[PDB]
Amino acid sequence: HWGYGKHNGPEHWHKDFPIAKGERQSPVDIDTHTAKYDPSLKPLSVSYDQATSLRILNNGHAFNVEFDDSQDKAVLKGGPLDGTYRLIQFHFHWGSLDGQGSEHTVDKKKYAAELHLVHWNTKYGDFGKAVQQPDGLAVLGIFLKVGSAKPGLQKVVDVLDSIKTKGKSADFTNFDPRGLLPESLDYWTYPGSLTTPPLLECVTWIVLKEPISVSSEQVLKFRKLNFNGEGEPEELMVDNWRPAQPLKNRQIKASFK
Structure with a gap:
């Protein structure tokens, strides 16, 4: 099945998922000199005060922090x-x-990591219905650079030991995602896709300009995770990014001058 290796990685995905070569694939390189400022764009509203995290999961590709989305x-x-x-x-x-890891790039610069906050359009009633629609998802993408520690990340880093291998999950309640956001909400936006199989072309991407800083120690704990299951040969969970895809007939818009 799919992964990130030589034999199953991104260049192979199109065989099982032919949309991989589609018209609106993600990620992309953001060429800051050709993204146009769009005065008609609004400020983003991020309202996470009542977020209810439930659980963290190692799915064998990455780890997912899951939320109660029933209200x-x-x-x-x-x-x-x-x-x-x-x-x-x-x-x-x-x-x-540290010189690689992000999916989006900015003038071909790769950041050490990228965070994706995934949201579904309530007009389609559930996530599985939403991913079948061109406006079904909005993903907030946030770059990570290595420098100072991000205090709001440490609770996540803390728990990774308990989910080392594929299929392991742990309770993860009361985590506040506001502590992962940068100071500014200036962004670029474009229409694209999920960056993992099934690669569905259902996402409005919102990529923040300002990176967050995390410490070397924090990142190093991400790189101790495993793509394998318990009792299988160890293969470190690193380089789980899809490279930039062709922009094709799309415009990237900036929210800021």
């Missing part, structure tokens, strides 16, 4: 979006070294 608790609105999008999960992509 409007944690929602994204505004910006480029019409209507209201509910937070369901977040996860990260990261590298084996």
Whole structure:
């Protein structure tokens, strides 16, 4: 099945998922000189005060922090979006070294990691219905650079030991995703896709300009995770990023001058 290796990694995905070569694939390189400022874009509204995290899971590709999405608790609105999008999960992509790891790039710069906060359009009633629609998902993407520690990440880092291998989960209640956000909400936006199989072309991407800082020690704990299951040969969970895909007939818009 799919992964990140030589034999099953991103260049192979199109055989099982032919949309991999589709018209609106993600991630992309953001060329900051050709993204146009769009004065018609609104400020993003991120309302995470009532977010209810439940659990953290090692799915064999990354780890997912899952939320209770059974009420409007944690929602994204505004910006480029019409209507209201509910937070369901977040996860990260990261590298084996600090010079790689992000999915999106900015003028071909790769960051050490990238955080994706995934939200679904409430007008389609559940996530599985939403991913079948071109406006079904909104993903907030946030870059990570290595420098100072991010205090709001440490609770996540703390628990990784308990979910080392594929299929392991742990209770993860009361985690506040506001502590993962940068100071500014300036962003780029474009229409794209999920960056893992099934690669569905259902996402409005909102990529924040300002990275968060995490410490080397924090990242190093992500790189001790395993893609394998318990009692299988160890293969470190690193380099779980899809490279940039062709922009094709799309425009990236900036919220800021």
